[PDB]
Amino acid sequence: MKVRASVKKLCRNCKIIRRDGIVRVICSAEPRHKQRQG
Amino acid sequence: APVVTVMGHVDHGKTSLLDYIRRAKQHIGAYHVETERGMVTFLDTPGHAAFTAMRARGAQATDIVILVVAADDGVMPQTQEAVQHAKAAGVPIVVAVNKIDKPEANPDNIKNGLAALDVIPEEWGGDAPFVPVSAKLGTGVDELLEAVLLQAEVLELKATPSAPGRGVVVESRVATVLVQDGTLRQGDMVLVGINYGRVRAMLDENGKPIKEAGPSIPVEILGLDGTPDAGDEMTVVADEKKAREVALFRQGKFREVKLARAHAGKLENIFENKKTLNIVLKADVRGSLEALQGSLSGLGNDEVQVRVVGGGVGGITESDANLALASNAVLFGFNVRADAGARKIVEAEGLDMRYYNVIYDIIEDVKKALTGMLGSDLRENILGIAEVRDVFRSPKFGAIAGCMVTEGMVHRNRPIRVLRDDVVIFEGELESLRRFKDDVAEVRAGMECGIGVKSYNDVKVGDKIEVFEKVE
Amino acid sequence: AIKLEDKKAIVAEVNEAAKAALSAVVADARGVTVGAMTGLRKEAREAGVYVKVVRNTLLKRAVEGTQFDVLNDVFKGPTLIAFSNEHPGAAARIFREFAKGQDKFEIKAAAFEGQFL
Amino acid sequence: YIKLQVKAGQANPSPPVGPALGQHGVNIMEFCKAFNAKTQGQEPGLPTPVIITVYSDRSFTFETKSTPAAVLLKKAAGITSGSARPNSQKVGTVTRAQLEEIAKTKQADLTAADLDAAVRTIAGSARSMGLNVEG
RNA sequence: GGAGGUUGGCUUAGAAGCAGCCACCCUUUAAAGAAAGCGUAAUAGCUCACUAGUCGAGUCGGCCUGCGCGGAAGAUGUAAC
RNA sequence: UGUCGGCUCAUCACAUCCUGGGGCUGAAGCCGGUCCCAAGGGUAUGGCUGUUCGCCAUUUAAAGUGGUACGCGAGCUGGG
Ligand SMILES: Nc1nc2c(ncn2[C@@H]2O[C@H](COP(=O)(O)OP(=O)(O)O)[C@@H](O)[C@H]2O)c(=O)[nH]1
Ligand SMILES: [Mg+2]
Ligand SMILES: [Mg+2]
Ligand SMILES: [Mg+2]
Ligand SMILES: [Mg+2]
Ligand SMILES: [Mg+2]
Ligand SMILES: [Mg+2]
Ligand SMILES: [Mg+2]
Ligand SMILES: [Mg+2]
Ligand SMILES: [Mg+2]
Ligand SMILES: [Mg+2]
Ligand SMILES: [Mg+2]
Ligand SMILES: [Mg+2]
Ligand SMILES: [Mg+2]
Ligand SMILES: [Mg+2]
Ligand SMILES: [Mg+2]
Ligand SMILES: [Mg+2]
Ligand SMILES: [Mg+2]
Ligand SMILES: [Mg+2]
Ligand SMILES: [Mg+2]
Ligand SMILES: [Mg+2]
Ligand SMILES: [Mg+2]
Ligand SMILES: [Mg+2]
Ligand SMILES: [Mg+2]
Ligand SMILES: [Mg+2]
Ligand SMILES: [Mg+2]
Ligand SMILES: [Mg+2]
Ligand SMILES: [Mg+2]
Ligand SMILES: [Mg+2]
Ligand SMILES: [Mg+2]
Ligand SMILES: [Mg+2]
Ligand SMILES: [Zn+2]
């Protein structure tokens, strides 16, 4: 997982969700596109 | 009565099958079994590496060879390397799927996987037999023993019993021989390679003392002055002075032939001395092997045919070097270096061995060799080697590695390769080298230093670093 | 995507052909490759049979000139209008053997002089 | 099954035909004569495609589709290399009389309604080479 | 379903939609890029763009603006109403 | 309001050196790289130099980074 301040989609399958008051990116295509914070 | 060699991939069943077959019907190096269809013998040590070394000495100590594969985990790279080693020598290959005693019991991928190697089975095209056997279970001894002879269908005459002594050496402990032609009544004077003696001890495989040696049967002789090599040849003489004169003539002729080989067999002397130039390829990855094989499969038609006789992935093991020597071939290492034993065989014999980094370079060189107009001594040189002994990487800039510099001078004005297991991993240039934390810029031979390479930090304990200059 | 101006443009082309066409059939095309459809369109083009694919909701709009109005009950699922321009019938023999070999489409229904068949 | 592009009558065991000996093992010397059975037809050299349908063991089939419409335009227009940059660096020239035959020798494998359309297929292929088409 | 001329031309040991450069047409079509991505040494192989069905009423994005959310780690003890 | 270093004795922060739990990897295995959570307990001996530091020699699971009048002379020393 990649922790930044500027989280955003990297491809079509990425998905912006908000979980316990934190913005996250979950991607079914590539497990490298996971992101936190931001 | 052929002479069989067992041959296959590691942990597939060779020793198991050999021991079983011997047990059904004290290790010296050879053994023999009598069956109603005819006596058949085997050599103790299996594997191509031992079979081709003696062949590299004109021995031709083989008639038939058998591959053992497994129903599970079938053709593996050393299996196809063995089939290469058997075709290059040239003997019919009789196959046997061993591990049919398992739940994974499908000799269906084996057949159509091994078929794409010119070992096509009978139901496919009719070229080489296939047989399921199982040393653990036992079901398959009969079919294999019948097929070993049914596939021995050359005339198979000669081996005229009453004949002068003529055999080949096997295990030079004291020694053994597996005679081809003649009889070896004990007490007779003998020339065994560059060596002389008389037969006092004539032990058998089981150790029962005898005095008569069969036509194609093994026997361990003891009484000779010492130990010859492992592939030399033995005959009968009568005069000790004759034996010594022949020995010295052999010394001189061998010292001549080594130079003649190291002269004419170079790549530089291709056109002068058809002739079907043989190469022996070794590449770093399978793609750069297949591509360059397909490139050198066709080069020139009416003058010289270039056919690759080897080809594997990894460093230049000494089995590869022995194969190249025996087939009078030219080594080729694309991004792979030689081991120690390969260096030993290379230094003793001739057998041109040249390294490369660009696919195009080998094609260019072979073109100029086939036209006989190639230049000599091109494409860089080795001006220093270092061995990595410790890798420490501080969290400010972590790339430094301790190195013991061996036989050469490593500098900063020359690019480098880093290589593990005699296979290169990276080719760049230096970033830092510093002794006692002080940035000296020239490291001597036999010294020790700390090397760090630019834009690559992955060196490990046990690597090597070569430094080279594109010299022209 | 398509536009409203083109939507009423494509119904005229079906309506223009259907005005003078004599024998028409309806068939599906799911599962058959576009490669295997080049052969069929080659056969029809040699025999003067006009084959086309239109939207179901546009076929009902297009077929209004009292030509094949007895077909508006089977415009469900994919469609392929195959109107016969010469030798009425014609584009039924082509569909007769093509259905057998290719294993696709039930050839829905057919219309001839107001016969649902 | 397997397909490739070999010359007009040689088809010898060579890097033109490398993986036919690995696809199913296959006696490739058999396929060499079989390809040579239809011989040159246009003298050896002109590349011709194949569709080798492989069955249990090494059953063959053999069609020889056509001769590709790139060597044909180079032949009828002189030079044997097309442009390294179309638009400007024109290389050849043809006429609507040559385009008639080069399509008439591929009326199989063009699936074009009438032959007037089959020409506009070829002229589109010319405009990528560097040739320029005219009367 | 996602095709045919066609491994588009050049280059290249090999460049086949997918190393790099130039183009970027045509055919059968409901639709299909001289190809957006993954893969191969080159192929092969798997998706996407696009279109035909099915489902029946809302749906998609941008602009202005009020209040909030992350970005936000320190040393004796909550300890920045 | 006695100013460097050594000795004795400590106390806190976490921006974690080891041990503990995880995500990604150009992660096959044995090793690693990087980021996240975690302050419970541990966290060298010597040669040179007045030295803190540093460089060497041999170890260790590791030989953390800082604040405390650059902690500590009505606790010692007195080499600078
Ligand atoms: N299940 C099974 N195991 C076998 C069979 N044959 C051999 N093995 C096992 O596989 C291993 C083969 O090793 P071996 O051939 O002796 O070593 P190698 O000479 O280097 O090939 C042995 O440990 C045997 O126990 C078989 O038919 N079935
Ligand atoms: Mg942040
Ligand atoms: Mg939670
Ligand atoms: Mg295993
Ligand atoms: Mg707002
Ligand atoms: Mg805020
Ligand atoms: Mg606190
Ligand atoms: Mg505190
Ligand atoms: Mg933390
Ligand atoms: Mg830590
Ligand atoms: Mg930890
Ligand atoms: Mg961990
Ligand atoms: Mg980790
Ligand atoms: Mg703490
Ligand atoms: Mg604590
Ligand atoms: Mg602590
Ligand atoms: Mg506790
Ligand atoms: Mg110290
Ligand atoms: Mg001192
Ligand atoms: Mg301070
Ligand atoms: Mg302090
Ligand atoms: Mg102080
Ligand atoms: Mg302090
Ligand atoms: Mg005080
Ligand atoms: Mg004091
Ligand atoms: Mg003091
Ligand atoms: Mg005081
Ligand atoms: Mg005082
Ligand atoms: Mg006091
Ligand atoms: Mg004093
Ligand atoms: Mg003093
Ligand atoms: Zn993604």
DSSP B118: T
Cβ distance of C45 and D113 shorter than 8 Å: yes
Query: Strand, coil or helix: what is B105?
Result: coil
Q: How crowded is residue B150: how many other Cβ atoms within 10 Å of its Cβ? A: 12
Point out the residue nearest to F26 (C-alpha to C1'): B458
Residue in B21, B72, B136 to alter for ligand 1 test, most ligand atoms within 8 A of Cβ: B136
- Write the CB contacts of B256 (distance below 8 Å, at least 6 apart in sequence): none
Which residue type is seen at D113? A
Rounded to a whole number of angstroms, the distance from the CA of D135 to the nearest CA of chain C is 30
CB B71 within 8 A of CB B106: yes
Chain D partners within 8 Å of B117 (Cβ): 25
What's the token pair of residue B185? 């009544």
- CA D52 centroid distance within chain: 16
HSE (side-chain half, CA atoms, 13 Å) at B460 = 6
* End-to-end Cα, chain A, rounded Å: 13
Q: Alpha-carbon torsion B311, B314, B316, B320, what sign?
A: negative
Which residue type is seen at C87? H
CA distance C73 to B313: 68
What are the backbone dihedrals phi and psi of residue B127, each rounded to the nearest 5 degrees, phi first? -130, -40
Chain C partners within 8 Å of D111 (Cβ): 38, 42
The answer to whether B287 CB sits below 7 Å from nucleic acid chain E is: yes
CA distance B123 to D57: 8
Resolution of this deposited model, Å: 2.9
CB D111 within 8 A of CB C42: yes
Pairing between strand B64-69 and B93-97? Answer: parallel
**Structure determined via:** cryo-EM
Point out the residue nearest to E71 (C-alpha to C1'): A5
SS in 3 state form for B369-429? Answer: HHCCCCCCCCCCEEEEEEEEEEECCCCCCCCCEEEEEECCCEECCCCEEEEECCEEEEEEC
CA distance B137 to A13: 54
B164 in a known ligand binding site = no
What are the backbone dihedrals phi and psi of residue B290, each rounded to the nearest 5 degrees, phi first? -60, -45
Q: Is the C-beta atom of B57 inside 6 A of ligand 1?
A: no
Residue corresponding to tokens 């002109």: D46
Q: Residue B199: which of B161, B232, B233, B237 has the closest Cα?
A: B237
What's the token pair of residue B198? 């008389």
Chain B partners within 8 Å of D25 (Cβ): 112, 115-118, 120, 124-125
Q: Is the C-beta atom of B136 inside 6 A of ligand 1?
A: yes
What's the token pair of residue B120? 């096509």
A vs B contact (3+ beta-carbon pairs below 8 A): no
What's the token pair of residue D97? 């009389």
User: What is the DSSP secondary-structure string of D20-84?
Assistant: HHHHS---HHHHHHHHHHT--SS-TTS-EEEEE---SSS----------TTHHHHHHTS-SS--S
CB B288 within 8 A of CB B313: no
Q: Residue B97: which of B122, B61, B65, B73 has the closest Cα?
A: B73
CB C18 within 8 A of CB C43: no
**CA angle centred on C53, ends C47 and C57, rounded to 5°:** 140
Cα R_g (chain A), whole angstroms: 9
Query: Strand, coil or helix: what is B102?
Result: coil
What's the token pair of residue B134? 């199982």
Query: Strand, coil or helix: what is C51?
Result: strand
The nucleotide whose C1' lies nearest the CA of D88 is E22
CA distance A7 to A24: 7
- Write the CB contacts of D54 (distance below 8 Å, at least 6 apart in sequence): D1, D2, D23, D24, D26, D60
Strand order in the sheet with B3-8: B30-33, B40-43, B3-8, B64-69, B93-97
CA distance B399 to B397: 6
DSSP D97: T
What are the backbone dihedrals phi and psi of residue B258, each rounded to the nearest 5 degrees, phi first? -60, -45
| H or E stretch covering A35 | strand A35-37
Q: Where are the alpha helices (DSSP H) in B184-299?
A: 240-264, 286-296
CB B358 within 8 A of CB B437: no
| H or E stretch covering B96 | strand B93-97
Name the CA dihedral angle for A4, A7, A10, A15, rounded to a multiple of 10 degrees.
Answer: 130
Residue in D18, D23, D25 nearest the CB of B120 = D25
Name the CA dihedral angle for B319, B323, B329, B331, rounded to a multiple of 10 degrees.
Answer: -10
